[PDB]
Amino acid sequence: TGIFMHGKIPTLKISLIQIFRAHLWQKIHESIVMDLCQVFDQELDALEIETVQKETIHPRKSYKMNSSCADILLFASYKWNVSRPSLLADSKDVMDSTTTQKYWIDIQLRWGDYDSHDIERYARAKFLDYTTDNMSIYPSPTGVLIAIDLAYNLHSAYGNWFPGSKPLIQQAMAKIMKANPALYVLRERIRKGLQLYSSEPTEPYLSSQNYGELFSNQIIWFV
Amino acid sequence: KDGYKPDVKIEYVDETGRKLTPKEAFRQLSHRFHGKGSGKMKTERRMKKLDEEALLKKM
């Protein structure tokens, strides 16, 4: 797991271990990667993508921050001009004179603390360190990397945004953070662990407009 | 950028076409990760539940 407990609090350690029960971190990372790949491949043909395949990444490469890798290895069938590696939150369209064919995308999982919640800056620093990493040998030097602030429910990516792919990456990340399956399960487990449960909406009343709505195929017994 | 709005709407619908519930989707993902499927009793319960749901949907 990505929980780097800087200290020894047995109560909080037990709570965190129970929250991540049944090998949740690796499954969540794999689910996020698969969701990103599916979202890309849904309309990859229009975005000039040749072939999208996930590289052979070790299970310990989804939680070890010391050594990273590339998540998605998607070809482009063309000389994709490698745009300058900048934050996705930036609206500046700057692309240096660099082109290639294979473009990579990466995703990282983090549990930010009160001070480590700056997803954008931490993600930019992680991407910069992975560009010149000693062991994180990504195949494409223009390989963007994404980050997930699971503790603070945030996501960011400050890598080489491919031309026309930054809006796609943003939409994919927004849709995931809205309805990521593994992330939703983790959030439900965290809510259950903290004895927190939102007041679920109640059934609405049948006004003069919904008076005839009770004659549908759903059996209603007016008790 | 070419310039357009993303027409992306992804989901997790089972091979039978039924949209798996988020709990059911997480169960399927965990089964795939663990590489283990449902048991005999789990299969029987799933079959009974599916048959009952289909019968209810029939009328």
């Binding site: 090998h23 689910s31 310990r60 | 795939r32 663990h34």
Partner: peptide
């Protein structure tokens, strides 16, 4: 011509009980 949607299956790569090597296969 309409808007036909065909969502392909998403078989997640096996992680546990692989009984193989360390790195995930292709």
């Amino acid at each position: 011509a309409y808007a036909i949607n065909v969502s392909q299956k998403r078989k997640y790569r096996q992680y546990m009980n692989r009984k193989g090597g360390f790195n995930r296969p292709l």
